[PDB]
Structures are given as C-alpha cells and as structure tokens.
Amino acid sequence: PFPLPTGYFGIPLGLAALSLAWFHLENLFPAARMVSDVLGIVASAVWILFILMYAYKLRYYFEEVRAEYHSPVRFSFIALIPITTMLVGDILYRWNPLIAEVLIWIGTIGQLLFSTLRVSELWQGGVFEQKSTHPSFYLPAVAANFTSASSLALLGYHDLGYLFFGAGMIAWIIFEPVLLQHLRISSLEPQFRATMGIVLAPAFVCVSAYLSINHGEVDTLAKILWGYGFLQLFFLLRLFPWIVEKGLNIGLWAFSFGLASMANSATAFYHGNVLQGVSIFAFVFSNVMIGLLVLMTIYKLTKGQFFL
Amino acid sequence: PFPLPTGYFGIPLGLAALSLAWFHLENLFPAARMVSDVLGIVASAVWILFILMYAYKLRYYFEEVRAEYHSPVRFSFIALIPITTMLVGDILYRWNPLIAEVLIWIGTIGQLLFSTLRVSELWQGGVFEQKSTHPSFYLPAVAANFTSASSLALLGYHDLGYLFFGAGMIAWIIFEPVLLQHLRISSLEPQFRATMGIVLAPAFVCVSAYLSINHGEVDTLAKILWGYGFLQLFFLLRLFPWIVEKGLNIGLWAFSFGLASMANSATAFYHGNVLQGVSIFAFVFSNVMIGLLVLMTIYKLTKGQFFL
Amino acid sequence: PFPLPTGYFGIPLGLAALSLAWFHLENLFPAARMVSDVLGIVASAVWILFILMYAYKLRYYFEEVRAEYHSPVRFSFIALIPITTMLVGDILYRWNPLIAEVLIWIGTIGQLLFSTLRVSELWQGGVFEQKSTHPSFYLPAVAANFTSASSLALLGYHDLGYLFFGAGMIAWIIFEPVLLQHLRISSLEPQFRATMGIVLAPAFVCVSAYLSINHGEVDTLAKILWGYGFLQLFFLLRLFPWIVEKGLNIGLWAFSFGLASMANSATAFYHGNVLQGVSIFAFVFSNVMIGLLVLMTIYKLTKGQFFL
C-alpha cells in the first residue's frame, strides 16, 4: 500500500483554512498576522510534501490511484488536492498575488473537471451503491465549489465566485438529505466514522464563502447558515464518543475544515458586531479543537502510528 | 396504557398558535384581542392539565416514557412539550413578560437538548428504519426550531432567533425530500395517516417565524414560503378523504399547527398589503378548520372517545 | 398506438421558450424581434396541431390517455400541455393581450389542478415505485409552477407569480435529492435516458422565472441558480455520449426547455451587465443546441422516423 492516504490532505486543508481565519483578524490583534503566517507556512510546507508524495504515487503507484479514482466512495478524497491547492493559493495571495492566482485557477479548473468527469459519471448507475453514500461525497460536489468561490472572490471575480458558491450550496442541500437518511438507516462502519466530521463542514463552509464573496456582510443567509451549522455541531458533539468509539485517529482531521470555516465566519461576524459572544466562543472552540488535532497528529508521528 | 398520548399536546399547541395569530390582529378589530385572550387562556389551561398528566406519567408510567423516548418514530412527539411551553410563554408575554421569558428559555433549552440527544442518536443507525420516516419527525428537528426562533424574536433576541429559524428551515429542507419519497413509495398506515397534517406545518411555520423575526416584513422569501405552503395545502386537501379513510380522530389536530401558522402569516401579509384577498381567505379557512377540530374534540369528550 | 406521444409537446414548449428568450432581445438587435416572431409563430402552430391531435386521442384513444394519467411515471408528461399553453399565451401577449391572459389562466388552472389531483395522489403510495423516480417528474411539480409564475408576472400579477415561483422552487429542491440518488444507484434505461435533459431544466427555469417576476434585476439568487445550472450543464455534457448510447431520438427535446431558459436568463444577465461574456456564451450555446434539435427533427420527419 501507499504510505500516504489521499485523505491525509485534510491536514494542510484545515491548517490553511485556520490560517485564513486568523488572517481575517489582522487588525484587531497584532499577533494575529504572525499566527496566520505561521499557520499558512506550515500548511504550505505540508501541502508541498503531500503533493510530492502523491506525484510519487502517480509515477510508481498508479494502480492505487486508478482504483481510488474509479471507486464510488474513495474518489471523493481526490478532490482534497485541488481544494488544498486553492487554499494554499489563498495563503500565498498575501505574499505573491500572481502565484496565488495561478494556483487558485489551477485548483478551480482541476476540481471543476474532476466533478464533471467523476461526480456526473455516477449518474450512469451500477457502480454507486446505497452503502456508498458517505460524508466524504461533500468534498468533490460541495467543498470544492465553496473553496473555488471563496478563492475567486479573493481574486476580485465576485460574480464567478457567486456562481461557484451557488453551485456548491445547491449541491450541498441536494445531497445532504439522502446522506442523513442513509446515516439514520444503515449506520456507518467504524473506519468511516471519522469522516462524519465532514457533515459539519458544509454548513460553515457555505457561510464562510458567502461572507468572503459579499465582503463580509452579515445578511440573513449567514445567520441561517450558522443556525444549521451550530445544530450540526451540537449533533456531532453528542455523537463524538460514538465517532471515536474505536479510538483516536488521523481521520478526525475531517473536522478541521468545518472548524476552520467556523472560525473564519466567526471573525467575519465579530467584525459585523453581530452575535459577538457566540462568534468569540466559536472561534475559541475551533482553535482549541484544531490545536488538539495538531497535538494528536504530533503524538502519532512520534509513536509512528501516522503513516500506513 | 396512559390515558394521555403524547400526541395530544397538539391541542394546546394549535390553540396557542391561533391565539397568537389573533393577537396579531389587535388593532384592526376591537374584539380580536378578546378572542386572542380567550384562545390563549384555553390553551394555557389545557397545557397545564397535560403537563400535570405527563408529570404523573413520568412518576408512575416511566416505562412508557422510556419506550416512547427510545422509539425511532414515537420520540418525535415528546418535542410537542417544549413547543407548547414556548407557545404558552409567548401567550403569557402579553401579561407577565418575566414568566414568558422564563418559559420561552426553558422550552428552547429543552427542545435543543432533546434534538441534540435524540435526533442525533439516529445517525448511529440500526434503530431508525425506512418505515420510521414519518411526518411527526418534523416536530423535534423543524417545528421546535421555528417555535424557538419566533419566541426569541418576541423577546427581542432577533439574531438568536435568526439562528434558530435557519436551523429549522434547513432541517426542514433536508428532511422533507426523503419523507415525501417514502410517502410516495411505502404509503402510510391508517393509524399514522392523521399525522400527515404535519406535512402542512413546516411551510407555514417557517414563514410565520420569518415574519416574526424580521418585524413582519413581506420579503420574497415569505411569498415563496406561502407558495409552497399553499401547494402543500391543496395536496393535503385532495388527500383528506384518504387521511380520514377510517374516520375522524383526535389525531387530526396535527393540522392545527399548520392552520394556525397559516393564519398568523395571513395576518402578517394583510398588514403588509400583500395578497390581501388570499390572506383573508387563508385566515378564515384556518379559523374555520380549527373550529371544526374544536367541535370534533368536544364531541369526542362528550361521547367518551377522547382518552385512550 | 396513438401516433403522437405526449412527450412530443416539448417541441412547441422549447420553441416557445426560445421565442420568449429572443423577444427579450428586442431592442439590442433589429432582427431579434423578427426571430422571436418566427419562433413564436412556429411554436404556436405546432402547439395547435398537437392540441388537435391530443383532442383526437381523447375522443378516440381515451384508453391510452387513462393509462398514461394513472401511470406513476407517464402522468408527468401530461403537464407539458398546460406548460405549452402558458408559453403560447406568453407568445400571444405581444399581439393579443386578452387571448394571452385567457390562455395563461387556463394553463395555470389546468396545471395546478393536475398537480393537486395526481402529484398529491402519489402520497397514497403503492403505485409509485423506487424505479418510477424519473427526471420527467419535474414537469408537473416544478416546470409547471415556474411557467405559471413567469406567465403571471407577464400579466402583472407579481405576488401571485412569486407564490407560484416559490412553490416550484421548493418542489424542485425537495424532489431533486431523491432523483439524483436514484440515478446514482440505479441506471436509467436507454429509452428513458433522453429525459435526463429535464435535469438541466429546473436550475435555469427557476432563474428565468425569478428574473421575469422581479423585472430582470440580477440578484444573488439568480447568480446562485446559474451556478447550479452550469454545474448541471457540465455534468450532462459529460454524460451526453451515454444519453445517446442507443442513438439520437426526438426525446432529446427534453433539453430544449433547459436550453431556452438558459438563453432567457442569458439575455437577462447581459441586460444587467453581469457576466456578459458568460451570458453571450450561454445564449449562443442554447441557440445552437436548439437549432441542432430542430435539424434532427426535420431529418426524422423527412425519413419518416418521427411518428410512431
């Protein structure tokens, strides 16, 4: 097998999302920019390492890449590569806007092409099964569109960002019903339980992208999106002992994207003088959870229980 | 078996919702305030009686309470208690704002905790079944959130009300698809057919809550919500002979929440000079239907076919 | 059987939608009004011919009409008659507003009654099956409501148009999840693959109706709707070789409604100076695709492969 699973890309993804969330606090806190820079540099280094390892996989492990691409469930994790690429471009935009725009466009085109080629292929039927409805399916159809929308908004293409954001939002609200019904009916295997944290992602990622596109204006839509996001957060907090029933694992980084988007939207709301206490609580909670994830990853690295 | 099914809480629930709907017509009609006061007092008395009966059930019938709480389908009716509590708090707000706030907060916390502890347990799987997808599932995930949002808006917490309203709205949008698909596929047993009236509830309850939070402004969202609510109302009117295939019963009070929310939104739309004729028709239809429900309940009480 | 399938009504439907889209370009081009008039006249003639054929069917083939009405899947195509009637009324509104209003009201009442009588009857269950979830179900529940909303907006009834538009939009959002899940799970049979083009319709029909009701003011909702519409357009472009695996057929006109609504929304967006390049591309693409459909229909007619 390949040492690095494609699902490990959630580490740089979450770190970059948290870096952007901290970047949004540049003015109110002098060390916020330093924290954002540190997080962004760490995320960029991790993303570079993972991209090189995935290139090695393509060159010498193309059979596994083909298997995961053709699988009805594992293909969704390949969408983490363009998402993390767009996030790294967003990070670099504070230093080199040209490289940032190049990376953002590369990631947007890559994720759009991947969704067109694979997510639409499922409509043919026969390969996708009722037990293939996993939370990871948000990554190609939902998370990628929101990330592309936010990145394009960062580049100034606000109308194209609106298009991508709407695509992601409607895909999210069109897929989540069947996903939740399947979770209610057919449970979820322990090895796939860590991916339940992706259920927290779309609700907060949508509001983060919307606030990025519309210059951080807190409309009724953003408040509604936090309503659902906090409902989901409470639901998953009550289920966390069941998610980690078999123990802590690197798969819990799936919560990282949701937590970082929650922190970003929390900064946006705090800037708007709306639900300031709730925003502070959400930001602190997301930061503490991501710090615990980082500590767990460090412990796994030291103990050697990280790579496969 | 306890003489009071947990589903009988829809009587005070609908009566209180209609009382608030009439309260909204205080200025336009001099006896509207008297009608609202009468409805609110009757609803409060019925709610107090039912709360005492349920406390008796807890003290001496805790086995049945546990069975209904752990059931994947019957648990949803326990959410009627916090909803009725919040509605009674809303009623009392016109007399004792402090008691109203206390009841509203108690109900909001209770329903949020119930949804977190039970609606999220279903995701574990193995207990919820495809045949457990019933209209009653709206009560914990949807109706409770809308009622909490409207109550908080009544207290002045408009942003928290927006959060709760969005949670309820997105929960409704996420659950209704599978519910309607199941209804199309697996029919519905006669004993559960009376609960089909809850399908009418979310569309009108959402617009009622939205108009409560945003100071009764008729936005495009309210018009859209009435569009879908009237579509569903026509759909259920065509199905009413099928719903009462085995005769009228106290289960028809499930329509009461939808009718009362329709009346409240009708008052809100009439105040805004938007579709005044349709608003008057909806208000009159809701009042007449709830009066018919009250007459049926009185007939059952006299005949002795009310308690189980 | 009867020579003309009820699904052939998509020809006048698509032609009329494209005629309205071109009519929206009256001022920009001198020949735009002439093109719109030609398209509208051809669509009206085809609709008159098909209505006469369907009247002949009712008088002398009522058994087939009853069979398609009672079928859980074939009934949806009967909604094409009121939809095309409303579109023809919209066309005639430029010449005889009174006849246009009469036709629009007749079509609105007919489609509303059909949905109430049949779409709601499916909730009884036992006749609708998991394999009856086809894209054609959009026609009675979604496309009809959007067309009625747009037609009513054309007549000046903007609030009633908003009601119908919201009904259609929420019906679309409530049905698409299970439809896409079924498509992913079970492959659509080749004879029903041509109807996959109806999946493209709702996303663009919704934005077209919204622009018609709100005076073509490009709002965030319109941009979101284009986002999802273009996502679905790419998805179906990837799938087109699979849709026509067994060859081209008159069933491909199902794409006509989606393409024409895309063209109409393209005119609306170009008017507002929002994504002008994308608007031009969408308009040209829709016009070229509908022209290809027209050429295919002409070739089928010449080769005697059009009627059954």
Numbering used by the authors:
A (entry chain B), B (entry chain A), C (entry chain C): 6 to 313
Paper text:
We successfully elucidated the structures of all four samples with an average resolution of 3 Å. The HiTehA purified using GDN achieved the highest resolution of 2.9 Å, followed by those purified with DDM and LMNG at resolutions of 3.1 Å, and OG at 3.2 Å, as detailed in Table 1 and Figure S1. The four structures of HiTehA closely align, revealing a minimal root-mean-square deviation (r.m.s.d.) of 0.13 Å for all atoms, except for the sample purified in DDM, which showed a slightly higher deviation of 0.26 Å. In general, the structural integrity of the trimeric arrangement remains unaffected using four different detergents during protein purification. Remarkably, none of the detergents tested appear to induce any significant alteration in the position of the gating Phe262 located on TM9. This observation underscores the robustness of the trimeric structure and the stability of key functional elements within HiTehA, even under varying detergent conditions. The identification of a linear density within the channel cavity across all detergent conditions suggests this cavity can be occupied either by detergent molecules or by other hydrophobic molecules such as co-purified lipids.
